[PDB]
C-alpha cells in the first residue's frame, strides 16, 4: 500500500535522474560534426548470382566465416548450405519441425543451429565420419518460440525466446548456465560483440538491453523506438549498434554515451524494417524492408545512396561477408541473391 | 566442362542430385490439406480432436484418400501478431465454440461471460489481413447440455435483447445467425456452421465436404474462369 506508493515515487525520481544524467552529456549530434566530409557516390550493385531451390518463404540466412559458404532456412522444412562462388549446393538437411524462424553458422564451420515456434533449439554437426549430418544436441527449457541464436564458441550458444527470456547454454552438458531476465515483452533479436564478452538484445516492449555474459546481469537499457524491434546489429568497432523497428525507422545507439546517435527514416517509407546490417568499414548500413526492396544508407550522413530493387515479395533476411566482397538477401518469394 | 577441373565436375552432379530431392519433396507438401484449429480453452477442441484422432501441436488423419494436418496453437500464450502470418496459406480455419456456456461467467473479469469472449475471438480472427481469402468452419458444441440448461434458465441472461420462447430450436438458430453476422468480407469468404454433440462421423464428413468446396473454387479461380 503505502510502501508501494513510496517505492513507485522513488523509482520514478530515479528515472528522472537517469534522464537528466543522460541529457547533461549531449552537446552536438553526429550530423553536426560529420557535416564536413564528402558523400559516397550512388552505389550500383548488380545481381551477380541467384540461388534458387527453396519452395516456400525464406526466414533466415547466415554467412560462413570464410566468406564463401552460407546457410539458409525456409518453411518448406529445409536447411540448405550453398557455395556462393559457383552457385553449388553442398548440403540439404531435413528438419523435424517445419515452423522454423532462425539459423546460425559456427565460426569454425563444424556446426549449424536451427529453431523456431517449437520452443527447442537444435544443433547439427556438419563434419562427421559417416558423410551425412545428424543432430548433435537439442536444447529445451524455453516456454516460447525461439527468435534468435548465435554461437559464442564451439561449446557455448546464446538464445532469445518468446517467453521474454534470453539464455546461455553449455552445449556439452545440456542445461542453461545463465538466464537473462528483465524484458516485459517478446524478445525478437540479439547480436554478439566482436570480443564476445557482451551482447545486445531487442524485444517487443520497444527497448534494448545490453547483457554481460560472464556475470550474467543487465548492464544498460536503451529506449526511443515506438514499436517492436525486429532487427539489431553491432558496429564493426564494437562501441555502437543499430536497431530496426516496426515503425519505418532505424536508429543508432552509442554504448559509452547512452544516447541516440542518428535516425534513418524517410517520409515516403511507411512500412516496417525486417533486417539491418553494416559494412566492413561501417560506412554503409543496409536495411531490408517489406515494401519488397532493400535500402543502402550512408551511415554517417543519414541520406540514401542506393537501392537493391530486385525482389518480388518481402525481404526477410540479409547479410554481409567478413571481407566485404558481397551482400546476400533472402526473400519471401523464395529467392536469395548476391550483390557486388 | 572445359574450364571445370575433374573435381569441380563432381560437385556439379552432387548439387544436381540435391536439386532432384528438393523438387520431389515439394510435390508431397502441395498434395495435403492444412487446417488451423482455434477455440477458447474448454470449447470442446479436445473432444473435436478426439473424434478425429488417428509448443505447437500437430495432428494428422486420413479420410477418402486425403491427408489432413491440423495445427493447434493453444499453448503459445505469446503475442499472436508475430506468428499468425506463418499460417497464411492453409486451406481452412476450424473454430470451436461451446454453447453450453451462455450461463457461465468468465473468471478473470466476472462481468463478461464466456460466449462474449468467444465472439470477440471469432471477430478478431475472421477479419485478419492474412486470412482475407480463407474459409472458416464453425462447430457449435455441447448442444446436449444446452437443452437442459435452456428450459430452467432463459438465454435472456446473455441475450436480454432476445424476444423468444426459450425454445431449443429458435434459440440455437438465433445463436448461429448471431455468429455468422460477424463476417465483414461477404464476397471472398464463407462460413460453414454445424451443430455437434458427441456425434460420430458427421464432423469428419462435414469437414471433407467443406474442404472439397474450398478446393473446387480455388481450382476454378486458378485458370481465370472464376
Amino acid at each position, epitope marked *: 500500500g503505502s510502501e508501494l506508493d513510496q517505492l513507485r515515487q522513488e523509482a520514478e525520481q530515479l528515472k528522472n535522474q537517469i534522464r537528466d544524467a543522460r541529457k547533461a552529456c549531449a552537446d552536438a549530434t553526429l550530423s553536426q560534426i560529420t557535416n564536413n566530409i564528402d558523400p559516397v557516390g550512388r552505389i550500383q550493385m548488380r545481381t551477380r548470382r541467384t540461388l534458387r531451390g527453396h519452395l516456400a518463404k525464406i526466414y533466415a540466412m547466415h554467412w560462413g566465416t570464410d566468406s564463401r559458404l552460407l546457410v539458409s532456412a525456409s518453411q518448406d522444412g529445409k536447411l540448405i548450405i550453398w557455395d556462393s562462388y559457383t552457385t553449388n549446393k553442398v548440403h540439404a538437411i531435413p528438419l523435424r519441425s517445419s515452423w522454423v524462424m532462425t539459423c546460425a553458422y559456427a565460426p569454425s564451420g563444424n556446426y549449424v543451429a536451427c529453431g523456431g515456434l517449437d520452443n527447442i533449439c537444435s544443433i547439427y554437426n556438419l563434419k562427421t565420419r559417416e558423410g*551425412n549430418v545428424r543432430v548433435s544436441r537439442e536444447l529445451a527449457g524455453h516456454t516460447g518460440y525461439l527468435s534468435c541464436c548465435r554461437f559464442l564458441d564451439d561449446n557455448q550458444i546464446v538464445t532469445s525466446s518468446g517467453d521474454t527470456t534470453c539464455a546461455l547454454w553449455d552445449i556439452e552438458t545440456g542445461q542453461q548456465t545463465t538466464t537473462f531476465t528483465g524484458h516485459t515483452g517478446d524478445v525478437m533479436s540479439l547480436s554478439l560483440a566482436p570480443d564476445t564478452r557482451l551482447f545486445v538484445s531487442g524485444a517487443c516492449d520497444a527497448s534494448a538491453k545490453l547483457w554481460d555474459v560472464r556475470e550474467g546481469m543487465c548492464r544498460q537499457t536503451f529506449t526511443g523506438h515506438e514499436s517492436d524491434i525486429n532487427a539489431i546489429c553491432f558496429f564493426p568497432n564494437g562501441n555502437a549498434f543499430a536497431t530496426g523497428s516496426d515503425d519505418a525507422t532505424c536508429r543508432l545507439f552509442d554504448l559509452r554515451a547512452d544516447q541516440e546517435l542518428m535516425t534513418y527514416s524517410h517520409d515516403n517509407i511507411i512500412c516496417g524494417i525486417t533486417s539491418v546490417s553494416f559494412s566492413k568499414s561501417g560506412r554503409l548500413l543496409l536495411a531490408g524492408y517489406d515494401d519488397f526492396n532493400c535500402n543502402v544508407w550512408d551511415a554517417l550522413k543519414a541520406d540514401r545512396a542506393g537501392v537493391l530493387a530486385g525482389h518480388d515479395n518481402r525481404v526477410s533476411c540479409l547479410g554481409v561477408t567478413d571481407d566485404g566482397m558481397a551482400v546476400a538477401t533472402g526473400s519471401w518469394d523464395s529467392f536469395l541473391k548476391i550483390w557486388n | 566442362g572445359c574450364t571445370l577441373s575433374a*573435381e569441380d565436375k*563432381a560437385a556439379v552432379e552432387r548439387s544436381k*542430385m540435391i536439386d532432384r530431392n528438393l523438387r520431389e519433396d515439394g510435390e508431397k507438401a502441395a498434395r495435403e490439406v492444412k487446417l488451423l484449429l482455434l477455440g477458447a480453452g474448454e470449447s470442446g477442441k479436445n473432444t473435436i480432436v478426439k473424434q478425429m484422432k488417428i509448443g505447437i501441436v500437430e495432428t494428422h488423419f486420413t479420410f477418402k484418400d486425403l491427408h489432413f494436418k491440423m495445427f493447434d496453437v493453444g499453448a503459445q500464450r505469446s503475442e499472436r501478431k508475430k506468428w499468425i502470418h506463418c499460417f497464411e496459406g492453409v486451406t481452412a480455419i476450424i473454430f470451436c465454440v461451446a454453447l453450453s456456456d451462455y450461463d457461465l461467467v468468465l473468471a478473470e473479469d466476472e462481468e463478461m461471460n464466456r460466449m462474449h469472449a468467444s465472439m470477440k475471438l471469432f471477430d478478431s480472427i475472421c477479419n485478419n489481413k492474412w486470412f482475407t481469402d480463407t474459409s472458416i468452419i464453425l462447430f457449435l458444441n455441447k448442444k446436449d447440455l444446452f437443452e437442459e440448461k435452456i428450459k430452467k434458465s432463459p438465454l435472456t441472461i446473455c441475450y436480454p435483447e432476445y424476444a423468444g420462447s426459450n425454445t431449443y430450436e429458435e434459440a440455437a438458430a438465433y445463436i448461429q445467425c448471431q455468429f455468422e453476422d460477424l463476417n465483414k468480407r461477404k464476397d471472398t469468404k464463407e462460413i460453414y456452421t454445424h451443430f455437434t454433440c458427441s456425434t460420430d462421423t458427421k464432423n469428419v464428413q462435414f469437414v471433407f465436404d467443406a474442404v472439397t468446396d474450398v478446393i473446387i473454387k480455388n481450382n476454378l479461380k486458378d485458370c481465370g474462369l472464376f
Partner: single-chain antibody
Amino acid sequence: VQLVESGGGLVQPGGSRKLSCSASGFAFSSFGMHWVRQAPEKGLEWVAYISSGSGTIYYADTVKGRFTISRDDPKNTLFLQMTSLRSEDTAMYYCVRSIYYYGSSPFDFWGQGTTLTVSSSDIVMTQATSSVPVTPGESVSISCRSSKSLLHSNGNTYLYWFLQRPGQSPQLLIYRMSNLASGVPDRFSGSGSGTAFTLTISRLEAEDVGVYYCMQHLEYPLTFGAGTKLEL
C-alpha cells in the same frame, strides 16, 4: 566405418572375375568409389571410377572397355567385373572412397583390398629416389616431380601424398599438396610449386618407416609415381 573387399584368387590365363566390397558404417549412397591396382614390389595404379548416382564412369586405358564397374546402392555393395584376363593383371586391388564438395578430402578411407594373381599424353609422375636410410630424430624429405603444372586456374593443386606401412594398407597424409588428413600428427608437411614438390617430416618417430606415394588428380587418367622407401 569399414569397407570389406572380396573376390580375389588364382585365375586362369584367359578368364573373367568379379570383385565386391561391402560398405558398413556410413552413408554409402553419397560416396564416389574408385578401384586401384598395386603390383608386387612395384607402385600402385588406378583402375576405374563410378560417381555417386551412377551417372559418370571412367576406365583405365589399359583395360578401357575390358572391365566394368557396377553399384548396388540399397544393399551397399560395389562391384568390378573383369571380362577378360591376361598375364599382366597380377596385382592386388584396393577400393577407395571419396566425396567431392567444397572442402572435402577425397581418398579418406582406403579399404583393405584383395590380392589377385593371374596364372602365367598422360601426365608423368616421377619419384626419382627408391630408398632412403635415416635414423630417428632428424628431419627428412621426399621429392616428386610432374611433366607440367598442376596449379589450375581456380587455385587448387591436385597433388596427393600418402603412405603404405610394411604389411598395411595406405592412408591419406596430404590432399591437394597443402592440407593434412584427419587423425595424422602435425609432424608431416607438404610444400612445392609449379611442377616440383617436397614432402617433409620434422620430428622422426618409429611409425614413419614405410613407402610414400605421390598422386595427381588434375584429370583422368590418374597417375602414380614409383615408390620412395624410407629405412630406420
